[PDB]
Design a protein around this ligand. Structure first.
Ligand SMILES: Cc1cc2nc3c(=O)[nH]c(=O)nc-3n(C[C@H](O)[C@H](O)[C@H](O)COP(=O)(O)OP(=O)(O)OC[C@H]3O[C@@H](n4cnc5c(N)ncnc54)[C@H](O)[C@@H]3O)c2cc1C
Ligand SMILES: Cc1cc2nc3c(=O)[nH]c(=O)nc-3n(C[C@H](O)[C@H](O)[C@H](O)COP(=O)(O)OP(=O)(O)OC[C@H]3O[C@@H](n4cnc5c(N)ncnc54)[C@H](O)[C@@H]3O)c2cc1C
Ligand SMILES: COC1=C(OC)C(=O)C(CC=C(C)C)=C(C)C1=O
Ligand SMILES: COC1=C(OC)C(=O)C(CC=C(C)C)=C(C)C1=O
Lengths: 363, 363
């Protein structure tokens, strides 16, 4: 038997670790040969020597249970995974954990070797460093995070964020959280340009230092900057499975799953992470929880025992520390519960990834 | 000098305590002669002997610095507070903390003495007890909380909730929190009736046991129950100040305040709590924070020192205990922060009120 995991992100490495613990034969497949803590990618492109902490070699940990490859198709009837080099992997169980894609520097999903990947980000740090005037296109989570990490490292640099809606960030965040985001950006000195779209986006020289660039909006507004960073429009990454399930995807590219995280019409295909069409925020935190359920259900498949049901409201959360970071803000109430915000760890959880992967964090 | 506080709720008693600590002369004015932990009112009307924990005598604590009265007008030019018994109180500083009003059992803002108030709720417990079939009108926070406290105490009772929108609870809650509310109600056995409004609401016999009552909606739908509980439409309570500031209120009845919580055109009137028009969730937790700022600024008024600014994002929150209740759910992320839900204390924070008021909780 063989569990093939397509996608070695937060979901895929959590499921690969467990399958290794359970001694279940598997192959993890990913475009890169290293994992990318994508949550800390924006910092990786601003702070020197930091991208080295955001990429972990797959083969040091998983050995020959890893195969670098770009999946271009899935044959669910013959149970084959089709790579772009013409090769095929047979599976008994398929876990799809393809996550989300979008422009560099926020996402980095391409065929590339760990050293070039790190050096792609270290080149970006130095082009940021050269630029006194930076435009960041797009005001979602990637754009906001990019803006704030520039003024963090370079408080005197002029950063500008342009966004096509009325408020920053994601509609499914509280209008008072979006507004809080607007105000954390203003406190840092980031100048905003809301409700207007860049025109001729395609013609911009991006990720490079270029003195006196002129960006025109659709409103005719003009700003002059020394560098454009593109943070427009992160989508679910359906490239690996669109040909197989295209008719049947959700509107946003995600896969429909039953309560055991199996694909609607298949007992031996599962989806986890961003690519699963679940009514819940697409986070790395949940992808690990999805992984836990899907490996459970592969084992129960083997032992002809009842499948476990992914309970979205899993209470697997405790303040990371013991009064070392107690303070929290209150943001709402409803029956039995209180909406609260807490601060993200300052290392952006990188230490966890190195632990999951069983490698010393480099220095 | 005299600080007159109109409204002795969470805001008003927090500001009265502090003014007593600061030895600043004040008069607290409230309709009732007891404070009402309104957050635990719905439980008070379901669980026997519990309403006695939700009302605290004002005069045991504040003495003659308390005056029972219903304020019917404010003269901000002569600095007079006008009571319904014809009497007038002069002030040097006015704190308006009038909160929110709406139907019993959720709110209880009327001229009444502590013992009748408790006995009004203990009568409701017994009418709930008599009823096998309960309709709760309205699916906001009061309706949802009422539904869930009935099935809590009486798991076999049939409770029905009817609401006029598409999802339970408040639009400014996350669509996945509203949906979580929908599902906490379904897990308890509460039958929902969404997107339809009761017709002829006025003709219903409410808060009383009446076998075989027939409620018709505007859709023509019919349900037969033994009791109607009304939880429709909590508004800001502008009764004390509408005549003075009517032209100038916000759309929802709240008072516009500067960053020091003073009313727009007055240096000696402040608003705190629900009645302040601040971009933040109307909670008891924030009203105490508003109180802290407004008493600070009355002192700074006395010492000709700079006014403090109410920072909405005040980080005055630490998990109530030390690992005694660590687990929390994750519900989102944005720059620097994580949306999390935590469980409300099971006593609904009643102990705090008795502490603030310096009285032994009765038993
Ligand atoms: C700015 C920002 C900040 C964030 N912060 C947080 C945070 O603090 N906490 C949090 O929990 N979440 C956070 N997130 C969300 C988080 O990054 C994602 O939800 C998470 O990465 C989902 O993991 P995954 O396993 O589903 O997929 P991913 O981690 O996106 O991994 C998918 C993998 O699949 C591979 N792949 C895809 N298609 C193919 C193919 N055809 N062939 C081969 N390989 C393929 C890709 O190369 C990639 O390695 C943030 C997101 C952004 C943009
Ligand atoms: C079901 C439900 C659950 C809730 N749960 C929570 C929770 O867990 N946590 C939380 O923080 N918040 C919670 N809230 C919100 C909370 O109850 C209110 O935000 C809070 O009471 C606001 O306090 P306040 O001081 O502004 O006014 P209130 O506590 O409403 O007090 C106002 C007072 O003013 C008096 N008054 C008004 N007009 C006059 C007048 N003209 N003359 C004399 N006296 C007058 C009234 O008698 C009343 O005593 C909940 C609300 C509901 C409905
Ligand atoms: C970066 O991905 C993430 C994790 O895995 C490394 C987490 O464990 C967690 C959970 C951490 C707790 C303390 C909330 C979060 C929130 C997360 O975003
Ligand atoms: C009932 O009113 C309330 C308070 O005062 C009694 C609080 O202190 C608090 C704060 C409690 C912490 C632990 C979140 C909340 C949430 C509240 O709702």
């Amino acid at each position: 038997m063989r569990v093939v995991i397509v996608g070695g992100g937060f979901g895929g490495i959590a499921a690969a670790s467990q399958l290794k613990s359970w001694a279940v034969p598997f192959v993890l497949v990913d475009m890169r040969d290293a994992f990318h803590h994508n949550v800390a990618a924006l910092r990786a492109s601003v702070e020197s020597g930091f991208a080295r902490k955001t990429f972990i070699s797959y083969s040091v940990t998983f050995g020959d249970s890893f195969r670098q490859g770009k999946v271009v198709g899935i044959d669910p009837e013959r149970q084959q995974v089709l790579l772009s080099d013409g090769e095929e992997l047979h599976y008994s169980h398929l876990i799809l954990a393809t996550g989300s894609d979008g422009p560099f520097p926020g996402k980095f999903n391409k065929v590339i070797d760990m050293e070039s990947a790190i050096q792609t980000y270290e080149d970006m740090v130095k082009e940021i460093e050269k630029s006194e005037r930076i435009l960041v296109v797009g005001g979602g989570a990637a754009g906001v995070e990019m803006a704030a990490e520039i003024k963090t490292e370079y408080p005197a640099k002029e950063v500008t964020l342009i966004h096509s809606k009325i408020a920053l960030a994601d509609v499914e965040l509280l209008q008072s959280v979006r507004q809080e985001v607007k105000e954390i950006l203003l406190r840092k000195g980031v100048r905003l340009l809301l409700s207007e779209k860049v025109s001729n986006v395609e013609n911009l020289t991006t990720n490079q230092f270029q003195k006196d660039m002129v960006v025109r909006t659709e409103k005719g507004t003009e700003v002059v900057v020394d560098m454009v960073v593109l943070c427009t429009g992160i989508k679910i990454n359906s490239s690996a499975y669109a040909t197989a399930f295209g008719d049947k995807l959700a509107s946003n590219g995600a896969l429909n799953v039953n309560k055991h995280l199996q694909l609607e019409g298949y007992d031996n295909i599962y989806a986890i992470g961003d690519c699963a069409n679940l009514k819940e925020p697409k986070m790395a935190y949940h992808a690990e929880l999805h992984a836990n359920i899907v490996v459970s259900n592969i084992i129960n498949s083997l032992t002809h025992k009842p499948l476990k049901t992914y309970q979205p409201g899993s209470l697997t959360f405790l303040l990371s520390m013991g009064k070392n970071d107690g303070v929290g803000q209150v943001k709402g109430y409803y029956v039995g519960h209180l909406l609260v915000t807490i601060a993200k760890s300052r290392d952006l959880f990188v230490s966890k990834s190195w632990k999951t992967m069983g490698q010393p964090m480099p220095s």
